[PDB]
Nucleic acid binder design. Structure first.
Ligand SMILES: [Cl-]
Ligand SMILES: [Cl-]
Ligand SMILES: [Cl-]
Ligand SMILES: [Cl-]
Ligand SMILES: [Mn+2]
Ligand SMILES: [Mn+2]
Ligand SMILES: [Mn+2]
Ligand SMILES: [Mn+2]
Ligand SMILES: [Mn+2]
Ligand SMILES: [Mn+2]
Ligand SMILES: [Mn+2]
Ligand SMILES: [Mn+2]
Ligand SMILES: [Mn+2]
Ligand SMILES: [Mn+2]
Lengths: 99, 108, 84, 92, 96, 77, 104, 91
DNA sequence: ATCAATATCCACCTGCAGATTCTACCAAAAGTGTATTTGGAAACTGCTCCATCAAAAGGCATGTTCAGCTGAATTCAGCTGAACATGCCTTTTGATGGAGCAGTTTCCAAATACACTTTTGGTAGAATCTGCAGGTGGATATTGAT
DNA sequence: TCAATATCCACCTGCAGATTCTACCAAAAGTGTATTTGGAAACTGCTCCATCAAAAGGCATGTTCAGCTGAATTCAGCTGAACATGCCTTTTGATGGAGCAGTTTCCAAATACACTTTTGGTAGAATCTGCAGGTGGATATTGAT
């Protein structure tokens, strides 16, 4: 009885469905909070954050990366691939006007 | 003194005409504010709120729930053409995205 | 206090994978994780720099949600849900 | 420490369109954000409209033109309808 | 008889028109297109000549920019020929 | 009136955009895109013109229509 | 003495103040605000005219024309970002041909 | 009657390039540019004063607005020249 | 890789048409001086939230192995789009009146501002109410097979 | 078809979060008067539109074929799937106490307003420099070795 194994991509497609059906934040909270405070302290030392300010930043960042990954995915599919690569991200940001 | 009747009541509105007028005056848009501007504006804000709450309530029913959450607002907005353009550059916190998988990603 | 360093690495490979899945991505090149970290750091710096500018103008030491909402709005990315 | 919001008005409209349906506070914050954003968009367009025409007053007709500029299609059509109705009822 | 190879004249034209600034659509066809589209909003309208010219400048800048983005989309797919699917990708990503 | 935007003019626009080879289906597509653009711009310009109770769309009306679409145009103040 | 003279500026401080007052931006306008604003506008104008003159020289010409303004703005990192969504009538584009389109 | 910045842009041109001229179309572009940056800055400063429940736009609002609207080195030099002008004006 | 032949490009030129400056006048804008008011900065202070820390449970990151399947490279042809010659017709250029718009000006009726007083809708918090967060379990659906 | 695995979809109940109620009070409404403004009437130039024509030069068309796009085919190595291990995020909770907000007072800085001086805008006349098109190579490209 050979051990069970899903074919490459079947689990990826399940994950796409599960995560497109949900709305929870997808980055861990505390690491994101430390990233925010690190970047802020390199602008003005000894700043403080309302918790809702950090949560607003996390919502903003996650929406932005999900939108950019949609655009990246269309760029990869355009090149008749299924694997997104840095040149797809770079194309998406050049066309969006972000670089 | 005359019995006070709210401006929203005489306009037939749920949104507060007086507060909208105060906000226009203190928002430094023009030196003067016509009497009709806050009424029209409150009417429009109420109409759009009604549109969105209508569609969001239907979405909450479809998913077997009775309280509207951000996800229902997001589903309502992105599934409606005109709201989706109006709110084209808007992020609905906790809204998620619409299920959509490019056809070429599916197996044969 | 305590020295905060390299927190960009706390955006794990699995978290980036989850975000890409929500974006409909089925297969991810191995170089994507670092690129994603670079782009996220640029985005975050731009938003946080403007939020802090608002915070300094009001002579505060606490970044409020409204500072972040204003910073976002002026960058063309309106966020609903964090007023008041 | 008083803090105003549109919450009560959004809720009255909710009881109008879906009588037995409720709303979570995060969704209420989203609706408040929406009301403030569309207010600013319309007020800003009307302010510019009056400024372009060297007028000092924002009237319902500046609000109307602003509505036509910012809203898409059928949404603008029905909004112009409800705004005209309110102004005409208010005048009488 | 003398003949240039496919693409040599294309690159000559790219150089010539990227060095220049004259409008590239002829004026009268554009004025007629503008007036037709306007007539579909309120007939018997009038145009300052400079208004028609502002429209033409806006349209040409828009299409030239869109073609830069499209050309990059084509090259991304390892082509050198722009196709409608390239235009569509550029506009989808631009948010149009 | 769209067909009056010639294939050679579209090639010229494509060349300024750096395009070397043009598929035969680009031209109709380009016209469609141009048409949407023009309608949107003109729809707003005329609105400004009607608000001012004018019958002549001015250069400033077109600049306002462009600006509100996030496309600032210099040279026509 | 004009305020522009007292600030060491060429741009018109009084006009900037009238424009601030007449624009419905705030009910009051401080005295330093139009001075600061005119200084900033002059500085940016100087930057762009500097670069446009250098570009017009590179092309052996004496009158700055829109083309030199487009060249000046698009070849500079920070101005090109400031004017990112701005169309300069009669400006053309920067000469740029993708490497993969060239022969050899 | 009909205002523009042409005389001032001309003065600044003769400052940085004494021997160079400018066409009326290029001058129109400069005018549109001055009006555009003016509106951006004044509008940000207006929003700033409203956010902080203040009725006066002061040089400190113009400065913050410049820091928000200009990129990097441009913001630094603009804040610099604005501070320079204001201090020179106060005497 | 050179070579001569062919076709388009590009400095260089010069007069002059038209665009950019001299000329001169003048409303409106900018400045000045004086008088009067006021928004907000300073200095307090109560009291929210914010920072930090802890334990402990268990979810999730990490690190590894390894095979399926994808990207990359390569070959080939059929079909599409470039170049070119040709000659016809759309555009450009210019003119012509003159209808009909913009842009002004004056003057009152109608509209809006704004202080004070009265009233009441809107908010904060307390007190009820109640979906749904999670947790559990079977039905169904899908998957990959050897 | 089958075994393994995952998803789907009702059921259950307590409590965290939402809804309702209550009472205070801040702000809207009413009122009265002062101030601003919009439009009906009457003008006056001045832009655009309608129309016509000559003729210039740009475009439409049809043929040939160069070479590009897409298909077919091959292979190696990377990325996805599965698993163990154990770190550190999440959760809940408490504690100081920073620093937001909330108040009060009072000037530095703003507005108001009368009056005066300067200047930017404007339109014509009088001067200067890019442009038409020419020339003259000169630069690049092409087929042929
Ligand atoms: Cl890459
Ligand atoms: Cl009104
Ligand atoms: Cl296609
Ligand atoms: Cl000031
Ligand atoms: Mn640091
Ligand atoms: Mn006084
Ligand atoms: Mn006070
Ligand atoms: Mn493949
Ligand atoms: Mn062949
Ligand atoms: Mn009551
Ligand atoms: Mn559940
Ligand atoms: Mn009270
Ligand atoms: Mn002068
Ligand atoms: Mn020439």
């Amino acid at each position: 009885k050979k051990p069970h194994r899903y074919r490459p991509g079947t689990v990826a497609l399940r994950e796409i469905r599960r995560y497109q059906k949900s709305t929870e934040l997808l980055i861990r909270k505390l690491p994101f909070q430390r990233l925010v405070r690190e970047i802020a302290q390199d602008f003005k030392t000894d700043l403080r954050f309302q918790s809702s300010a950090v949560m607003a930043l996390q919502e903003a960042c996650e929406a932005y990366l999900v939108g950019l990954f949609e655009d990246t995915n269309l760029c990869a599919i355009h090149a008749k691939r299924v694997t997104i690569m840095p040149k797809d991200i770079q194309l998406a940001r050049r066309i969006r006007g972000e670089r | 003194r005359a019995k006070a009747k709210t401006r929203s009541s005489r306009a037939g509105l749920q949104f507060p005409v007086g507060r909208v007028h105060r906000l226009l005056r203190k928002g430094n848009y023009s030196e003067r504010v016509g009497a009709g501007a806050p009424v029209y504006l409150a009417a429009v804000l109420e109409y759009l709120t009604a549109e969105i709450l209508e569609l969001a309530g239907n979405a909450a029913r479809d998913n077997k729930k009775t309280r509207i959450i951000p996800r229902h607002l997001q589903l309502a907005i992105r599934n409606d053409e005109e709201l989706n353009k109006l709110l084209g550059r808007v992020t609905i916190a906790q809204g998620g995205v619409l299920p959509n998988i490019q056809a070429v990603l599916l197996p044969k | 206090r305590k020295v905060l360093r390299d927190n960009i690495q706390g955006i794990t490979k699995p978290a980036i994978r989850r975000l890409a899945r929500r974006g409909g991505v089925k297969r991810i090149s191995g170089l994507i994780y670092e690129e994603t970290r670079g782009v996220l750091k640029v985005f975050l710096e731009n938003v946080i720099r403007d939020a802090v500018t608002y915070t300094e103008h009001a002579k505060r030491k606490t970044v409020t949600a409204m500072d972040v909402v204003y910073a976002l709005k002026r960058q063309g990315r309106t966020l609903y849900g964090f007023g008041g | 420490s008083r803090k105003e919001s549109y919450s009560i008005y959004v809720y009255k409209v909710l009881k109008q369109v879906h009588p037995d349906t409720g709303i979570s506070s995060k969704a209420m914050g989203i609706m408040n954000s929406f009301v403030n954003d569309i207010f600013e968009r319309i007020a800003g367009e009307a302010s510019r409209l009056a400024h372009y025409n060297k007028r000092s007053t924002i009237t319902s007709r500046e609000i109307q033109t602003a509505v036509r500029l910012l809203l898409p299609g059928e949404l603008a059509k029905h909004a112009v309808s409800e705004g005209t109705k309110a102004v005409t009822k208010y005048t009488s």
